[PDB]
Every structure is written in structure tokens, then in C-alpha cells.
Amino acid sequence: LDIPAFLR
Amino acid sequence: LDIPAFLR
Amino acid sequence: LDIPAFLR
Amino acid sequence: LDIPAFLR
Amino acid sequence: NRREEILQSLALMLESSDGSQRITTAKLAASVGVSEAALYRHFPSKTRMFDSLIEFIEDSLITRINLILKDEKDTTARLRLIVLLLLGFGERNPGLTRILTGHALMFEQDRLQGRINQLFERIEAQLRQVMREKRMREGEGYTTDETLLASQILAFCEGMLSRFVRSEFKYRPTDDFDARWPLIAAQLQ
Amino acid sequence: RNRREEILQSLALMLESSDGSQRITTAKLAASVGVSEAALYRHFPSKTRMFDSLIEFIEDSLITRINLILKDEKDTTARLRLIVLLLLGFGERNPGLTRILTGHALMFEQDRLQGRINQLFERIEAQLRQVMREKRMREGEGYTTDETLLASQILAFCEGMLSRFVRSEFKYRPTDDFDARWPLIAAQLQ
Amino acid sequence: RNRREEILQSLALMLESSDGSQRITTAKLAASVGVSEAALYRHFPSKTRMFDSLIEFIEDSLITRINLILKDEKDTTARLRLIVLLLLGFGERNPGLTRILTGHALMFEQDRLQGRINQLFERIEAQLRQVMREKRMREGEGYTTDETLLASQILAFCEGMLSRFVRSEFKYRPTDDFDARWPLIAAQLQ
Amino acid sequence: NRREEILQSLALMLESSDGSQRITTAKLAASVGVSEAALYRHFPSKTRMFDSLIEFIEDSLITRINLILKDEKDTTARLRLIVLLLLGFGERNPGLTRILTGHALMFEQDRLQGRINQLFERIEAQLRQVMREKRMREGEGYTTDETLLASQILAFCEGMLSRFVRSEFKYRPTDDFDARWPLIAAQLQ
DNA sequence: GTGAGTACTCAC
């Protein structure tokens, strides 16, 4: 999987 | 068997 | 000559 | 005449 | 997108060592680069500002586990990814993590921690959903109680969400993960 | 003596209570003792000190016992149980002091106080490093998983229970069915 | 603009009224300005950054008005007299800011603010010593009394008249019966 | 006289660089070496402490100027000593000279300024007297108003001391004074 | 020991 981030 | 209980 | 004031 | 000194 | 620039400003703030202290609606605007009146004419309070941040965890985690299940079927694998899913989402969003851990929720109204308890309540039962489906998949169930099985693991994750906080993001959760793994794997006995 | 150790009580009585989630103000702290906001400062120089004494107590207690688990128990493996029961035994027994242990009560206070707890959690993880480091010293066969990557995992587990002990307003007691959770842990002494 | 000055008016009135003897607490001052204590901290960070502005006002009003003197009449006598009427005329036209000048109003405040008025005092006196030295040039004649000594005796009188304006509760005017005084001050001018 | 020490402790605190700041009954009770309960078993309020200290100022200065007007019959030499009793007394008593100037009493009842106000008013009168007598002792009246010259000399005397305190007692009053007096009698006409 | 000011805050 890939883990998403808020720091777009 | 000796648990230091602080409160009352 | 002219001495100013802070208060009006 | 002498000046007194309280702060002894 | 002004209702996504404030959030971004706030998220970064919880990461700065000013995260330990109470984030005021004053210094928030300053960082954003606006007035306090350019904040409240949107959000009715801070609670909404933080609620909009709570969501991104619920979504980028709950729906993300559910996605694992659909795709990944093997149990030992599933019970690993979910763990990585936790410790991973943390190190990548340390701002959001102080929210997860609760520390940065000591300042806001208590309804928010309760809504964080829920997040944990769901992912725990979801862990319990992967544990149940071992019998149906592999004719056999775990010898340990599932309710206490999952909880035991979720315990390990919070305590790795805490140590990341205590030290100010030096005790990273995703460090030595190929290593830590057989230990909790050996728990799944 | 008394005046000091009678307000620390009241402070703890708040930390455990429903208000313990909020900042503990000078105003409200007087309400418990019933005295004035000034009366407090006649016995402490600051509210910060009220939280340093608390921390000393936790630091003197857990650590006395750890230095008391060795000089009474050499069983390389039984040790941990006594430690892992000591820590989780303190929590359940001390709800308010746990809220400082976790570090939620510290939020309304100064970062200086956090170092204390860490430096405690780091003297505890060092007590643990020892216990298990000493294994081969006892029977020519030690471990495979590195002892520090272990000590962390062990204590990592604890900070999780102590967090649930708090964020559930004290409904998830750490000692509960410790006996069942434990063979899972001891299974990690590989 | 409209508001970052109204505040100073209220500080001023309180500073030359009955309450100049006490400190102008933000709560007291608020009631004057006519807006809550919180709206006071919307223009200035601290109480001390209010007085600081009130000082700078003086820091210009005297020196700027003196540079003008030096350029309009170059006779030292006529000049040494216009400057004396300045510091006196000001202190009397502004009762409030004189409590500041004499560093009495600053007692309730930071000692730093004094450090700024002492310098204000320097320049005034430092200006004096210059005028004396210049008289040797416009008309080949000077004084027989040391310029510094002579300068530090005038300031004395002016500093001494302001201290009576204050402690008499603004009863004893400084520039009152001036035209009779200055002939006495001009007597040590030789 | 375990009451004297307290006043001595009040002086030594009014003489230090903390004198520009308030003297708490706390950091006052500290010096003498007792509690704020024994402070008030010798004095009713903090006022009396200043009252007694001020009272010594009155006497001391008043008993000396009197003494001068008796053993010294010279009109000139008269105030040549009187102006030295002051400026001399200031430089001798650093702390006390804050009571005079009106910096120290800026914390207590205004009634304590009144005490001092009367003292100057009394000093300025017995000084005015010296000017008046010059007539009956020499026939030649003054070429300048007696009250006007009187005040004018006090101004210098409340200025030298005000400059004294302002610079924490660095610009000592009586320094270069023998060269300073000729600027005062220079008004005696 | 305490009632009362004490400069300055924070969320709305």
C-alpha cells in the first residue's frame, strides 16, 4: 500500500 | 502487594 | 514662541 | 556642624 | 481554497515545537497571513477546524483498511499492513498525530477525544473482523481471544504513537519495522 | 509538611475527575482545598512546583521497586512480569498520576516537565535493557532479537494501555486479564 | 489612527489628575478610554510601550523646538533664556507628561523608561554647553565659570522647578514670575 | 530597640538598586529575619515605618538649620551652610533622599507627601527668614524679592538631589560644590 | 491566612 499525507 | 496508592 | 500641549 | 547618618 | 489553506497552516503548527502549547486563533491567522476575522467568517469555532482534521484520519485510514481487505486476503499479511497503516500514517503526518494521541486535544472541547475513541473503536473491531475470518479461510481459529487479540496489537500502536510525541518526532514509529514485526507476529501464536 | 501534601491530594483529586481533561486553574484548585488563591502560594512558590512534586513521587516509586525487583528476584523472565505489572499496576492504582505519565496533564503546563517523564521512561527502558541483557549471564543462551529493540517493544506496549486508561475516562484498566495478555508478551522474549 | 491616540489621552488625564499619584492600571485606564481592558491590547503590546511613546513625544518637543531657537537668534543670552522658558513652559502646559519627565510616573513602571528620560536630559544639557562655547565666536567673549558646571546648574534649577510643580499637585506654576527669576539665573552667567 | 533594626532594614533597601521598585512587606520581612506577623507587632501599617523615618528627617534638618541661625550671624555664610546641610544630607543618606524627592513615597498614602511638602515649606521659610534679616543687620535691603530669591535657591536644592536619585546616586550633590556656591551667592544682591 | 487588585490572554 501507499500511505497518504496531509502535506499536499 | 504494596502498590503505592497516592490518593485517599 | 509656541509651547505645544499633548491635550487639546 | 555635622550631617547625621541614619543608615548605621 | 481558503478552507484548505488554514487547515494546512494548522496541521504544520502541530508539527512545530509550538505544537506542545495551546494553538490560539490569533497566531493561527498570523501564520495563515490574514485576520482573525478572515477565519471565523468561515468556521463557527475551533471545533469545526479540528473536526475537519479528524475526518482526514477517519477517511485516510478506515476506508483504507477496508480497501486492504477487498484486495489483500491473506491474514498474516492483512494483520501486518493494518499495523504499518497505523505506524505509517503517523510518521508522515506528525501534526495529525498529536490529535490522534489526544495531547493536542486537551485544548479543544471534549467531544473531539470521544470522536477519536470511536476511530479506535472501529479499527479495533475491524482488526477483529480479520481475526474472525481465519476459520472460514483456513479451517482454524486463533487460540487467543479475538477481542483481546486485536486490542493487544492496538495497544502496541498507541504506545508507538506516544513515543513519537514525547520525544518531538525523533522516536519514529516506522523505524525497524521489518524487525519489530516477528515479535507481534509471534504473539499471533 | 501537611499543608503541602494536602493540596497535592486535591490536585490529584482533580486529575482523576471529569475536569482533569481541562486546564487546572488557580481559581478552581482553591475550590477543592477551600482556601484562597493566595493561600496556595504560601506553601508553593508556583503551580509549576505542584507538578514537580507529583513527578518526583512517580519517579521515586516506580524506580524504588525496580531496584527492589532484582535484589529479590533473579528469574530473568519473571522479572519483566513484575516490572510490566509494576508499571501497569501503578496506572490503574493512580488515575490522576497516569494523566501526567501519559503527558496529557502536562499539556496545560510547561515543556520542562515533559523531559522528566521521558527521562523516566528512558530510565525504565534502561532497567529493562539490563534485565534481558543479563540473560546470557545466567544461562549461556540469551536472545536473537536485539535487547534494545525488545525493551522498546515491551514498554511500547505499556504506553498504549496507559493511554487507553486515560482516553476512556478510566474504563480500560491496565491490569485487567493481564494474565491472558502476558503469554503474548513473554512470547516476544525470543 | 483614530484610536491609537485616544488611549494616550486617557493615560494623560489620569496622569495630571488626582490619580497621577497611583499607577494607571490597565483596568483603571480602560474605564477612562471607554473600551474594555482587552481593546487596550489591540494597539500596544504592553503598558510600557504606551509610556515609551509618551516619552518620545517629549524627546522631540524640546530638542526640535530648541534647534529652532539656535537658528532664529544667535545671541547667547537671548538664547540661554528661550531654552529655559521651553522646558518650563512645556512642563506647565502639560502637567501630565511632567510626572513622566521627573520620572515619578515611571516608578510604577519599568526602570528602563527612566534610562530614556536621562538621555533626553543629556541632549538638553549637551546642547547648553555648546551655546556657551559659541558665544566666544559671535562676539569674542565667553564665561569665567566652567561651561559644564554652569550648564549643570541651569538644568538643576529647571529640574528643580519641575519637582515643585508635581509635589504641589500642580499648584505652583513653574513659569510663574519668570521674568523676575531669569535675571537671577543670568547672574551666574559670567 | 528591636524596632530600630526594621527601619535600618528599610533604609538599606531604599539605598540599593531595588529602591526604584516597591518594597514589599515580604522582601522587607525577609531582611530583618522574621515573619510579616512581627512586622505588624511594632507598626500598624507600612505608613508608620515611613512616618518615623521622615520624622527623623524633620528633626535632623530642622535642629541643624536652627543651630546655624544661632551660632552663625553672617547672612551670606548662613545659607552657605544651610544649602550644605541639604546637599550634604542627601549624599549622606541615599535611601532617605528618595523620600524627599518623592519617589519612595509614591507607593503609600499621599498623606506622606504632605509631611515632606511641609518640610520644604518650613525649610524655605527659615531660609526666607535669613534673607529678610539682612535688612535689620545691614540696613541695605535686598535688590531682589526675598521670597523670590528664597524659592529660587530651594529649586537648585531640589534639583541637585533629583539629579542625584535619577542616576542611582552617581551625580553626588556636594561634588565640585566649592566651585558651585559662587553661582548661588552670585544672586545675593 | 485573604480579599483585592495586576498586567495580559483567549476564543468568539
Added chain:
DNA sequence: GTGAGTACTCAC
């Protein structure tokens, strides 16, 4: 801008 705290001081 403000109603409402906000840790700590002061004279008694």
C-alpha cells in the same frame, strides 16, 4: 471589540 479567565502579587 469583549465577557471571562489567568498565574501570581500585596498589605494586612
